[PDB]
Design a protein around this ligand. Structure first.
Ligand SMILES: Nc1cccc(-c2cnn3ccc(Nc4cccc(Cl)c4)nc23)c1
Ligand code: NI
Length: 328
């Protein structure tokens, strides 16, 4: 059966919770577990109330994200297809209770400072079930970092790291992220100068420009092992495909076009589409400490621009990583 909230979030942990993010799915908090920063995603399941404009998922409907989070968590310690470019999953609990007042305090603080698009999660009864995922802390999302990068050289590292990570997961797991908007990309400072990955037994490096990129949040993701596919079937989800005001919302439509609304299938082109969306964000919606006023900088910009205009002619992140001139 479920555990009480106190099992997962005893007082000292609840007291160190700060809200760091959200989605329709629920809420994301940073805290401390054994002197170690962690991120906690909390999802309401199985209940009758509308939450953030939607019905709650059942356990069965959350299971793919759990599975995919576990599969991707293994990649940092594998050998033939290895990368630290996803995120560690530490634990998964099924919790029962009303929402902790201290979480609501952290929720209120975020709403007061950043503003929320969600319902204040204060209406759940003491029998409410939640899934609580504890992840490794992966840094700050790309959207909040949009005014914080040093230069387009940093941009280039981020794109290279993202492409490599997606390629390794394609090779290992026939993985598609399927929802890689700039909120789902994390940046953390690193003293490492070069980052390592292995793709089908071949190890290569990427200059870090002082950041380690982590791809997170596998709500729409798909993968397979030994012909058994795990995914989010969105073939009857009307609203996902009717969004507007951002190239993000075109990506959902373009994916559906590519796969003919068959989400069980493997279409690694979806990774390229997300990578195109991310490149676009980088060229249009970022402000850099170093401006576009030196030779080296104009050259990187031209390279990222050329990448943007050619990358949709590649078939997967693996194709991009292995063949695109940007990464040579
Ligand atoms: N897989 C996954 C899911 C959810 C959160 C995390 C996770 C791990 N570290 N970390 C650090 C920051 C952060 N911020 C954030 C911001 C907006 C939205 C979302 Cl979903 C997350 N999320 C995480 C990982
Ligand atoms: Ni436990």
């Amino acid at each position: 059966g479920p555990v009480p909230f106190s099992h997962c979030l005893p007082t000292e942990k609840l007291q160190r919770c700060e809200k760091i993010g959200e989605g329709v799915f629920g809420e994301v908090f940073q805290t401390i577990a054994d002197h170690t920063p962690v991120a906690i995603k909390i999802i309401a399941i199985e209940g009758p109330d509308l939450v953030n404009g939607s019905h709650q998922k059942t356990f069965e409907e959350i299971l793919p994200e759990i599975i995919i989070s576990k599969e991707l968590s293994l990649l940092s310690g594998e050998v033939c297809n290895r990368t630290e470019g996803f995120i560690g999953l530490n634990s998964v609990h099924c919790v029962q209770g009303s929402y902790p007042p201290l979480l609501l305090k952290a929720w209120d603080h975020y709403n007061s400072t950043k503003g929320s698009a969600n319902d204040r999660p204060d209406f759940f009864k003491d029998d409410q079930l939640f899934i609580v995922l504890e992840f490794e802390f992966g840094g700050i999302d790309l959207e909040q970092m949009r005014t914080k990068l040093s230069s387009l050289a940093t941009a280039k590292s981020i794109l290279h790291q993202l492409t490599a990570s997606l390629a390794v997961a394609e090779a290992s797991l026939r993985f598609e992220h399927r929802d890689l908007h700039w909120g789902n990309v994390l940046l953390k400072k690193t003293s490492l100068k070069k980052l390592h990955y292995t793709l089908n037994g071949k190890s290569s490096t990427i200059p870090s420009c002082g950041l380690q990129v982590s791809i997170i949040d596998y709500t729409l993701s798909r993968l397979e092992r030994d012909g058994i596919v795990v995914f989010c079937d969105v073939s009857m989800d009307e609203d996902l495909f009717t969004g507007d005001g951002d190239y993000q919302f075109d990506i959902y439509r373009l994916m559906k076009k590519e796969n003919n609304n068959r989400w069980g299938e493997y279409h690694p082109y979806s990774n390229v589409l997300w990578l195109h969306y991310l490149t676009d964000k980088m060229l249009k919606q970022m402000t850099f400490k170093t401006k576009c006023n030196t030779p080296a900088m104009k050259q990187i910009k031209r390279k990222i621009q050329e990448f943007h205009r050619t990358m949709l002619n590649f078939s997967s992140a693996t194709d991009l990583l292995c063949q695109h001139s940007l990464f040579k």
